[PDB]
Structures are given as C-alpha cells and as structure tokens.
C-alpha cells in the first residue's frame, strides 16, 4: 500500500494513508531511505527516518514492506563491517544470508536460564583475577575519557582467538577503522562482527545500533553457541534517544532524559544471558561501556546501567596517569558472579588478592608487619600492570600471581618486577611447558606443580 508525506523535518515525517500499517513496521521513502512507523494516529502516521532526510519532502510517496523491524543474520556477517540496518560499509561484497531476526525480541525467562559457571577469559590479569567475567554475565566498563575502556574490550576480543560483536555508537570513523586494523593485525577479525553507527549518522542509527548487535548475537545464542557483545558506548546511545524523544515532544525528566531511558538499557542488556540445557546451553556475554564525567558514578545514566549489569570495572584517571595501566580501581570494582566464573587454579591463588590490595591502598595513604605489607603490595601492583594489546593465557596469569602473592618477588627490586615476569614466562614456556599444560587440562594447581614451580623460580632467580 502507498502513502503520502504531509509534514517533514528534524528526522521525523507524518504520512497520510498506509491505513493497515503495522506498529514498528519498516517503511521505504522514494529515494531509498528507510523509516519506522512508531505512532499510528487517527489521521496520520508518525515515522522516524533511519537515514538522511534532506531529499524527503511533502508529497513524496512512501510504501509498505510488510515486515516488523528486522535485520539479516548469519555466518556471513563474520569479518564484515555493517550499519544497524545490516548493509556492508567495508565494500567487500554483499551479505549472503536468508535468515532474519527481529530487533525487538523478549529476553529469556526465569525458567529458560542456567547459573553462570563458565569463565570468559579477557586475558587481562587485573580483570580475570579480581573481577572475573563468566559466559552470560554482564560486566560494565565505566570511567572517564582516555582511561582505557575500549582497549580492555579489544584485548578481550583478541584473547578469544567465542563469536565477537563490537558495536560502535557515536564513534569517529577513524577510531572504528583503527579497531578493525587492530583485529586484522592480531587476526581476530575472522570471528568478529563490527556494527557501526558513527557520529555523522542520524540519532535513529545510534538508538538502534545496540539492538541490531544483540539480534546478530542471539542467532548464535539460541543455536547453542557462545557470543561476546561490546557496546561502545551506551552513553552516546542514551544521548541519541534523548534527542529523538525531545524532537517528538516527549516530556523530559532528570538530566533532560525521557522516563524510559532506564527501560532502554534494561531490555538491551537482559537479552544477554546463559540459556538452560533444554535450549542448547548457549551464552551471550555483554561488555557495555559508560563515559563518566569527572569520575561521577552518582550521575543518572551511570547509576541506571550499574543497577542492571552484573558488576562493574571502574577505571580511574589518577591511576592511569600515575602508571597503573589498566587503571582498574580495586575497591570500587566488583564481580557479582565471582568465583563461579573462575577456574579452581585462579580461585585458590587470587582468593584473597582483592582484599590484600584493598588493605594496601588504605595503608599506602599513611612497624615491621606494616612495612612488609607495603613492600608486598607495591610489587603486586607492578604485576597487575599490563601493556596494551597483549592478552596473557590463564595458565601464565596464575603463575605470575602465585609468584607475587607467595612473596617470590620480595628480594627483587620493584622496578625490575615487570622484566622478571616476562623472562620467567619465557623460561617456563620453553623448558617447563608441562606445568602450563597441566593447568590448561586440569584447570587446577596440584601440590606437585606448586613444589615444581618453587624450584623453577629459585633456579631462575640465581640465573637472573
């Protein structure tokens, strides 16, 4: 059926006709630009435009597709760069995929879930040890600009070398290109879908970008396969929805946001879950991002997402500048799943690691006992420091933490801890691969392996 535009402006269009139009149905303007019928009024149809509206005018003809907002999905999207609608921007042919999924779908119910007890290794010592992330968990990455929020997500994706879905919202093009370039270098692009709604694009794209990325991931989830999705970031997607709502003349609330700004993030994140054995037993892990202003956790949008997600990884500016990179604040950051999303090896060694470092920072601010704790704590900080784009395997992490916690670095200077770690792992990789192999298979440190490591360390110290 055909309709005619009466009013147009600000990425909104009122349409005459389309009498039997569905709610949230995809419409097509005569220039090839798409739209979404939100408000079905008595004698008009309020439509939001998903594109440029510069050549959309009064009198222009709009047609029905007869399909409720939906995007194609499949294996074709792997190693491709697409927009919310699902059109490739990279310029590497079209996306051959017949299977489609609706953007708005209900999340798994209470009965259609299983408790998260499967580690998703980021490859970052600070995260894996202190704030572990399981398959189906939602871990918020929150902090100021240039704190290393994106870096953590990229390093996580590289460590999966689990399907990845990097959703970019309100990002500069050159950043998305550099992220794609980073994945190519590491060789992690082959199993990574890149949804991109950059700053130039309309508010509609930014609003949709997370829902499209989630829909793509759900296809794998329901088939009984594991997925990781990354929203970078929901702060800009919130700002985009605020713009739309204010243009539609919806009444504003706190920080000029609409009432359903919490509801926006709620439905999105909840769809990330760990399904039951009856429904395959697939997963879909979420790494949402929020950009705080002057480390203001108390702000409206942060508090909303914090209350939804299953733990947070608060990054600080002061720590980042001081040299602690990644700059994860140990005291504030938490994992709600916790030990359940950790292998027994890591659980034992890094059981009371977060507590010791929380005591250290307290003591730092201000005996024999206290002096030893400061010297120990200072060296532990150096181990938690990790260079960019360098994910470590789980077996390598446990050994590095075991070294520090037991107090094998106490003799060595603090500045030489980083080089000691690197050279030690090289030695164990070469000679004592059996120790690493044991941890990989068993997922535990044996009493034999403990005594083996001790002797290996002592022998290496002499050589060092």
């Amino acid at each position: 059926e055909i309709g005619t535009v009466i009013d147009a402006g600000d990425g909104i269009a009122h349409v005459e006709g389309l009498p039997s139009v569905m709610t949230q149905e995809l419409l097509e303007f005569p220039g090839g630009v798409l739209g979404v019928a939100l408000n079905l009024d008595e004698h008009s149809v309020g439509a939001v435009i998903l594109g440029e509206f510069e050549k959309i005018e009064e009198g222009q003809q709009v047609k029905r597709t007869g399909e409720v907002l939906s995007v194609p999905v499949g294996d074709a999207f792997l190693g491709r760069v697409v927009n919310p609608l699902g059109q490739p921007i990279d310029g590497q042919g079209d996306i051959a995929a017949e299977t489609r999924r609706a953007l708005e779908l209900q999340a798994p119910s209470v009965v259609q879930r299983q408790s998260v007890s499967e580690p998703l290794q980021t490859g970052i010592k600070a995260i894996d040890a202190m704030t572990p992330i399981g398959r189906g968990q939602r871990q918020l990455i929150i902090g100021d600009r240039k704190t290393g929020k994106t870096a953590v997500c990229v390093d996580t994706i590289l460590n999966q070398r689990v399907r990845c879905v990097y959703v970019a919202i309100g990002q500069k093009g050159t950043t998305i290109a550099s992220v794609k370039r980073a994945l190519e270098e590491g060789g992690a692009m082959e199993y990574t879908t890149i949804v991109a709604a950059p700053a130039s694009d309309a508010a509609g794209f930014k609003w949709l970008a997370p829902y499209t990325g989630s829909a793509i991931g759900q296809h794998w989830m329901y088939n009984g396969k594991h997925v990781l999705i990354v929203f970078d970031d929901l702060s800009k997607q919130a700002d985009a929805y605020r713009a739309i709502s204010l243009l539609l003349r919806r009444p504003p609330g706190r920080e000029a946001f609409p009432g359903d700004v919490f509801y926006l993030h709620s439905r999105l994140l909840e769809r990330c879950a760990k399904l039951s054995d009856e429904l395959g037993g697939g997963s879909m892990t979420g790494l949402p991002i929020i950009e705080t202003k002057a480390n203001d956790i108390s702000a409206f949008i942060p508090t909303n997402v914090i209350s939804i997600t299953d733990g947070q990884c608060f990054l600080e500016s002061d720590l980042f500048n001081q040299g602690v990179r990644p700059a994860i604040n140990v005291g504030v950051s938490v994992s709600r799943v916790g030990g359940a999303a950790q292998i027994k090896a890591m659980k034992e060694v890094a059981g009371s690691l977060r507590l010791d470092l929380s005591q250290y920072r307290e003591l730092e601010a201000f005996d024999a006992a206290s002096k030893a704790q400061l010297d120990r704590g200072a060296r532990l900080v150096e181990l938690l420091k990790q260079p960019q784009y360098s994910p470590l395997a789980v077996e390598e992490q446990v050994v590095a933490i075991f070294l520090g916690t037991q107090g094998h670095l106490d003799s060595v200077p603090v500045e030489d801890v980083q080089r000691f770690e690197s050279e030690l792992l090289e030695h164990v990789k070469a000679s004592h691969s059996d120790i690493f192999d044991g941890i990989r298979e068993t997922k535990k440190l044996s009493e034999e392996a403990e005594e083996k490591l001790v002797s290996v360390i002592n022998e290496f110290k002499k050589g060092f």
């Binding site: 003349r249 009444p251 504003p252 609330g253 920080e255 000029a256 002057a294 203001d296 108390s298």
Partner: protein, 48 residues
C-alpha cells in the same frame, strides 16, 4: 619537622576537598539550569 608533615597532609586533603565540592557545584549548576527550563517549557506546551 612534625608540623611540616602535619600541614603537608592538611594541604593535600584541602586540595581533594576543593575538587569534590567543585564537581558537586557544577552538578548542581547544570541541574538547576536543566530543571528550571523543563518547568518553563512545560508551562509553554500546556497552552498551545
């Protein structure tokens, strides 16, 4: 020697206090502007 230490910490604490209040001020400053406008625009939309 002890005063040096005592007053050094006091100055460092004062710096921290200023930063916390300045953020709280800007939070309020922005909020008050946002809140006033929403009430004004709310009354305008009521008529027409």
């Amino acid at each position: 020697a002890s005063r040096r230490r005592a007053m050094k910490s006091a100055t460092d604490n004062a710096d921290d206090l200023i930063k916390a209040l300045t953020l709280a001020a800007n939070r309020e400053r922005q909020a008050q502007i946002t809140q006033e406008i929403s009430e004004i625009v709310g009354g305008a939309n009521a008529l027409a």
